[PDB]
Design an enzyme around this catalytic site. Structure first.
Site, PDB file in Angstrom:
ATOM      1  N   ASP A 423       0.836  -1.193   0.000  1.00 59.78           N
ATOM      2  CA  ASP A 423       0.000   0.000   0.000  1.00 59.78           C
ATOM      3  C   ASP A 423       0.882   1.258   0.000  1.00 59.78           C
ATOM      4  OD1 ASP A 423      -2.324   1.612   0.350  1.00 59.78           O
ATOM      5  OD2 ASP A 423      -2.283   1.321   2.558  1.00 59.78           O
ATOM      6  N   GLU A 426       2.954   5.222  -3.854  1.00 57.90           N
ATOM      7  CA  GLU A 426       3.012   6.219  -4.891  1.00 57.90           C
ATOM      8  C   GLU A 426       4.383   6.947  -5.032  1.00 57.90           C
ATOM      9  OE1 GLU A 426      -0.739   4.711  -4.201  1.00 57.90           O
ATOM     10  OE2 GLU A 426       0.325   5.869  -2.685  1.00 57.90           O
TER      11      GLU A 426
HETATM   12  O1  LIG Z   1      -3.496   6.028   4.939  1.00 60.80           O
HETATM   13  C1  LIG Z   1      -4.401   4.956   4.669  1.00 60.80           C
HETATM   14  C2  LIG Z   1      -3.566   3.740   4.249  1.00 60.80           C
HETATM   15  N1  LIG Z   1      -4.356   2.641   3.639  1.00 60.80           N
HETATM   16  C3  LIG Z   1      -4.909   3.084   2.344  1.00 60.80           C
HETATM   17  C4  LIG Z   1      -5.414   1.878   1.581  1.00 60.80           C
HETATM   18  O2  LIG Z   1      -5.864   2.297   0.290  1.00 60.80           O
HETATM   19  C5  LIG Z   1      -6.512   1.208   2.397  1.00 60.80           C
HETATM   20  O3  LIG Z   1      -6.961   0.027   1.739  1.00 60.80           O
HETATM   21  C6  LIG Z   1      -6.009   0.852   3.789  1.00 60.80           C
HETATM   22  O4  LIG Z   1      -7.067   0.288   4.550  1.00 60.80           O
HETATM   23  C7  LIG Z   1      -5.399   2.065   4.508  1.00 60.80           C
HETATM   24  C8  LIG Z   1      -4.818   1.681   5.867  1.00 60.80           C
HETATM   25  O5  LIG Z   1      -3.626   0.898   5.719  1.00 60.80           O
END
Ligand SMILES: OCCN1C[C@H](O)[C@@H](O)[C@H](O)[C@H]1CO
Ligand SMILES: *[C@@H]1O[C@H](CO)[C@@H](O[C@@H]2O[C@H](CO)[C@@H](O[C@@H]3O[C@H](CO)[C@@H](O)[C@H](O)[C@@H]3O)[C@H](O)[C@H]2NC(C)=O)[C@H](O)[C@H]1NC(C)=O
Ligand SMILES: *[C@@H]1O[C@H](CO[C@@H]2O[C@@H](C)[C@@H](O)[C@@H](O)[C@@H]2O)[C@@H](O[C@@H]2O[C@H](CO)[C@@H](O)[C@H](O)[C@H]2NC(C)=O)[C@H](O)[C@H]1NC(C)=O
Ligand SMILES: *[C@@H]1O[C@H](CO)[C@@H](O[C@@H]2O[C@H](CO)[C@@H](O)[C@H](O)[C@H]2NC(C)=O)[C@H](O)[C@H]1NC(C)=O
Ligand SMILES: *[C@@H]1O[C@H](CO)[C@@H](O[C@@H]2O[C@H](CO)[C@@H](O)[C@H](O)[C@H]2NC(C)=O)[C@H](O)[C@H]1NC(C)=O
Ligand SMILES: *[C@@H]1O[C@H](CO[C@@H]2O[C@@H](C)[C@@H](O)[C@@H](O)[C@@H]2O)[C@@H](O)[C@H](O)[C@H]1NC(C)=O
Ligand SMILES: [Cl-]
Ligand SMILES: [Cl-]
Ligand SMILES: [Cl-]
EC number: 3.2.1.20
Length: 845
Positions: A423, A426
């Site tokens: 996650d 980016e």
């Molecule tokens: O700042 C949020 C970070 N993450 C973004 C992801 O898109 C989302 O699926 C996830 O639950 C969440 C917490 O890990």
């Protein structure tokens, strides 16, 4: 000079608001729009580059390009080199480079279908489809800009129909009405008009008649792609070189395959990865997490993979688990495996930098080995994310790859997780650039800033001028997610010795060779349900078939009705996971009313029954660059009524899914291409039976408990019996659904292996079988048979479109023990005792 049709005006002031006087001083035309369309535009005589010394080589062509009048951007590169390479009959490749300086490049009858000509002054490349003379590319339509931080190359488009240029929330077919499409990877909940998590500088353009071609600009810099209604397109990039591939198709499926030939065929997922995944932010202990599995099982819902979000970590840090709620994390995961399930958990790229020295190995070891992105003074760039202050791994650094491999293997030795959910890659930053800001230079403040959310390349990420092993972040930003996906893929191979399962937020072209994707922080709304269909289709065109959205939606609170419809549709996402935000009401299947549960259970059961077919589709994606979920126009491109359809989807060639995507509907209207389409509800799994379409829209009953799924005549689908996991289901007997054409014909196939091992195709450790119906017989043809698959039991054959009751049904020449025929549905259901790996013959009369 300035008499240019409104729709063919190319913007001469893309950089700033401009007056008539300034516009004319640039050598441009000023004509206000009468109601978007540029007011300041290039006359046909605007200075471009001139082609000089065109010469022929065995590869194709080389030339020099010379600009003699500077543009209004700084640092024009006045002398360029053109190289044209006729690489295959389907693939044309050209580059425009600075011959004096190595610039950043993204790291890595017999006749072609194309012909190429050049305009001399102004310079342009013109690509014809040889077969019909259609002009596909023509870069003469506007000037070539090639400055240090601004490249612009334009072309005419052959029609108003163009798809690609992810990641954005839009229809599958992009709007050509003065649309600016921005590629700069960005953490933002999907919303229209915005640069989202990934960037794929590829388009597929349809041509009148149903041929198509594709164009890939191999450039990873921040860019705008501008579409206008003439129709035409302008690539506007902030760095690198022009490196252009044209794929001649002619079929849209061939375009996609040809593109994937360059960027990589999709990786083959493990079979278990195609099962149901369940997650939320907020499973705050192993006890709660175990209860999820217990509650799913108790209510007979299949679940292959249990996930956790940030909850498991110690103070939100990678490669740790807290000793309160997750004290017995290792045992929980071992137990999941004993029950035949797998386990996935979130991993962030950012590494906590604030802990006492020696107390947090990922940071301490990262520091020792120099794995982090660094700033001007050569220290780690420090941002803010979940654990607080963090450094950012540089996944272009071979030493960082080695470090990531070690961190993953070491953590796997404590807790034997089965893949990685990567996650925030980016890379997302809660503050702008870094804790210490960013310097003032041309990379941080470039002469052209694309249409990014927040108006700066630093917004929600790290400084553009920060240093990575291969180049600056300015050039590499759009590869960040991809590079982590590659690192994690390799890490998982080394740690586990079987196929990796990586699901990534940020992506770039070529991502699908290593990993899958989910569409991010979608709202629990009917609007986002509907929007998920074009987006899932788009990612399949881009070679990332292992894609889906969070089933029932991530942000906000789902409704029961929405979650029923979303589970129904979501059961046809190639990657199916229900995931949910921290403050949201629960949305696990078992949390709903009994009737809603029944409908969710039916959707899951159907998906599980279809898994041998879905797996075979992934095999075709992996071996031939096919799509798994595909738009109707890929399968029926010569039917122009399909071109704008994006709220229906096919699985492969044969399975048409027509979901309800709105509240309060008990019916749905969908397009049925010419052919016979059998209602899948007539196939026994453990309202017209057939739609006879001339190519037309058909209204279908669709009560709350139903999603419409039709099987195309001429196709055979393999199915397998039920289970709460793939470990269970893979041991069940199989069946065939045989959809006869009016002439009694059908074909299909099954690919089978152990579901997990690496190098299966290379080692030949698979079984591959073709099924054929013809003249009241069904046979298998053994393409390959090995230990994996040979003993698969075929116990049921369901034949659709049998017009008259048979008097006898034989299996290998002997009357079968049991069959039934329904005169109402035209379905012949046959019990058999056969093996997929041994030649059989089933017949009736
Ligand atoms: O700042 C949020 C970070 N993450 C973004 C992801 O898109 C989302 O699926 C996830 O639950 C969440 C917490 O890990
Ligand atoms: C490049 O990154 C490094 C971090 O790796 C940056 O170091 C940071 O520098 C600032 C000062 O410029 C430090 O702030 C100072 O902290 C002390 C107390 O801790 C305080 O008394 C001072 O008034 C000031 O606030 C900061 O601590 C330091 N960060 C770390 C983690 O040591 C560096 O500034 C970056 N360089 C550039 C040009 O951005
Ligand atoms: C276009 O090419 C000409 C000719 O270049 C020569 O032949 C080529 C095949 C290659 O072998 C080159 O290395 C040769 O120089 C260029 O004109 C020449 O320019 C050079 C250097 O200025 C000069 O010594 C010669 O007298 C010129 N020869 C002729 C026949 O004019 C010309 O500059 C090239 N144009 C551009 C824009 O690069
Ligand atoms: C490629 O695009 C260029 C520019 O639009 C076209 O060139 C123009 O063609 C018209 C009609 O023939 C002429 O009146 C102009 O003189 C041309 N402009 C320039 C700048 O050369 C060209 O026709 C296109 N080529 C193809 C094959 O479609
Ligand atoms: C799993 O299901 C059980 C049983 O339905 C849930 O336990 C109930 O939780 C509610 C709170 O919403 C309590 O009021 C009840 O006392 C519980 N009932 C029983 C019979 O124990 C449990 O919350 C579910 N767990 C998860 C993780 O979904
Ligand atoms: C999501 O729901 C949260 C809790 O809502 C409350 O409890 C449930 C059971 C309902 O009875 C509801 O009417 C109650 O208000 C809210 O706190 C939260 O704001 C909601 N989020 C959104 C985006 O609407
Ligand atoms: Cl003005
Ligand atoms: Cl062709
Ligand atoms: Cl560089």
């Amino acid at each position: 000079q300035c008499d240019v049709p409104p729709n063919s005006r190319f913007d001469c002031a893309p950089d700033k608001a401009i007056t008539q006087e300034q516009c004319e001083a640039r050598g441009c035309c000023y004509i206000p729009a009468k109601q978007g369309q540029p007011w300041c535009f290039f006359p046909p005589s605007y200075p471009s580059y001139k082609l000089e010394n065109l010469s022929s080589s065995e590869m194709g062509y080389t030339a020099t390009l010379t600009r003699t009048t500077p543009t209004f951007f700084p640092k024009d590169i006045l002398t360029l080199r053109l190289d044209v390479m006729m690489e295959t009959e389907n693939r044309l490749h050209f580059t425009i480079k600075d011959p004096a300086n190595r610039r950043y490049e993204v790291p890595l009858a017999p006749s072609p279908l194309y012909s190429v000509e050049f305009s001399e002054e102004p310079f342009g490349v013109i690509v014809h489809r040889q077969l019909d003379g259609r002009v596909l590319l023509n870069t003469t339509v506007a000037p070539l800009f090639f400055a240090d931080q601004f490249l612009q190359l334009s072309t005419s488009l052959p029609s108003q129909y163009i798809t690609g240029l992810a990641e954005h929330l839009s229809p599958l077919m992009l709007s050509t009405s003065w649309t600016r499409i921005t590629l700069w990877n960005r953490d933002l909940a999907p919303t229209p008009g915005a640069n989202l998590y990934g960037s794929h500088p590829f388009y597929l353009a349809l041509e009148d008649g149903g041929s198509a071609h594709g164009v890939f600009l191999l450039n990873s810099n921040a860019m705008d792609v501008v579409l206008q209604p003439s129709p035409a397109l302008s690539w506007r990039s902030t760095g690198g070189i022009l490196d252009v591939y044209i794929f001649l198709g002619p079929e849209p499926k061939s375009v996609v395959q040809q593109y994937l030939d360059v960027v990589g065929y999709p990786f083959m997922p493990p079979y278990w990865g195609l099962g149901f995944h369940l997650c939320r932010w907020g499973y705050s202990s192993t006890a709660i997490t175990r209860q999820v599995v217990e509650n799913m099982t108790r209510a007979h819902f299949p679940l292959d993979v249990q996930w956790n979000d940030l909850d498991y970590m110690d103070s939100r840090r990678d490669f740790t688990f807290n000793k309160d709620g997750f004290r017995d994390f290792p045992a929980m995961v071992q137990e999941l495996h004993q029950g035949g399930r797998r386990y996935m958990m979130i991993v962030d790229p950012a590494i906590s930098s604030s802990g006492p020295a020696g107390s947090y190995r990922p940071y301490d070891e990262g520091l020792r080995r120099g794995v982090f992105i660094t700033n001007e003074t050569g220290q780690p760039l420090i941002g803010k994310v979940w654990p607080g202050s963090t450094a950012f791994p540089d996944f272009t650094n071979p030493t960082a790859l080695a470090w990531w491999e070690d961190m993953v293997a070491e953590f796997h030795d404590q807790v034997p997780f089965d893949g990685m959910w990567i996650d925030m890659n980016e890379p997302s930053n809660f503050i702008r650039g870094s804790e210490d800001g960013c310097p003032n230079n041309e990379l941080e403040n470039p002469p052209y800033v694309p249409g990014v959310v927040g108006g700066t390349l630093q917004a929600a990420t790290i400084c553009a001028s920060s240093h990575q092993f291969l180049s600056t972040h300015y050039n590499l930003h759009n590869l960040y997610g991809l590079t982590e996906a590659i690192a994690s893929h390799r890490a998982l191979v080394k740690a586990r010795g079987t196929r990796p399962f990586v699901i990534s937020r940020s992506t770039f072209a070529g991502h699908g060779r290593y990993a899958g994707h989910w569409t991010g922080d979608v709202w629990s709304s009917w609007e986002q349900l509907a929007s998920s269909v074009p987006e899932i289709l788009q990612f399949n065109l881009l070679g990332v078939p292992l894609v889906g959205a969070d089933v029932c939606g991530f942000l906000g609170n789902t409704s029961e009705e929405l979650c029923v419809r979303w589970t129904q549709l979501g059961a046809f996402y190639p990657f199916m996971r229900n995931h949910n935000s921290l403050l949201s009401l629960p949305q696990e299947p078992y949390s709903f009313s009994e009737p809603a549960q029944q409908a969710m259970r039916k959707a899951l059961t159907l998906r599980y029954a279809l898994l041998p077919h879905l797996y075979t589709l992934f095999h075709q994606a992996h071996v031939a660059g096919e799509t798994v979920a595909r738009p109707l126009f890929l399968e029926f491109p010569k039917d122009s009524s399909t071109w704008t359809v994006d709220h229906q989807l096919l699985w492969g060639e044969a399975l048409l899914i027509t979901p309800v995507l709105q509240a309060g509907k008990a019916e749905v209207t969908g397009y049925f291409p010419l052919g016979t389409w059998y209602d899948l509800q007539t196939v026994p799994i453990e309202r017209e039976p057939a739609i006879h379409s001339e190519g037309q829209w058909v209204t279908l009953p669709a009560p709350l408990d139903t999603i419409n799924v039709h099987l195309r005549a001429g196709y055979i689908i393999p199915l397998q019996g039920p289970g709460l996991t793939t470990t269970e289901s893979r041991q069940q007997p199989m069946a065939l659904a045989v959809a006869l054409t009016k002439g009694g014909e059908a074909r299909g196939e099954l690919f089978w292996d152990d579901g997990e091992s690496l190098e299966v195709l290379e080692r030949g450790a698979y079984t591959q079988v073709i099924f054929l119906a013809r003249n009241n017989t069904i046979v298998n043809e053994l393409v390959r048979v090995t230990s994996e698959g040979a003993g698969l039991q075929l116990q049921k054959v369901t034949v659709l479109g049998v017009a008259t009751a048979p008097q006898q049904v034989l299996s290998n020449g002997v009357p079968v023990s049991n069959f039934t025929y329904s005169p109402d549905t035209k379905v012949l259901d046959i019990c058999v005792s056969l093996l997929m790996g041994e030649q059989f013959l089933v017949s009736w009369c």
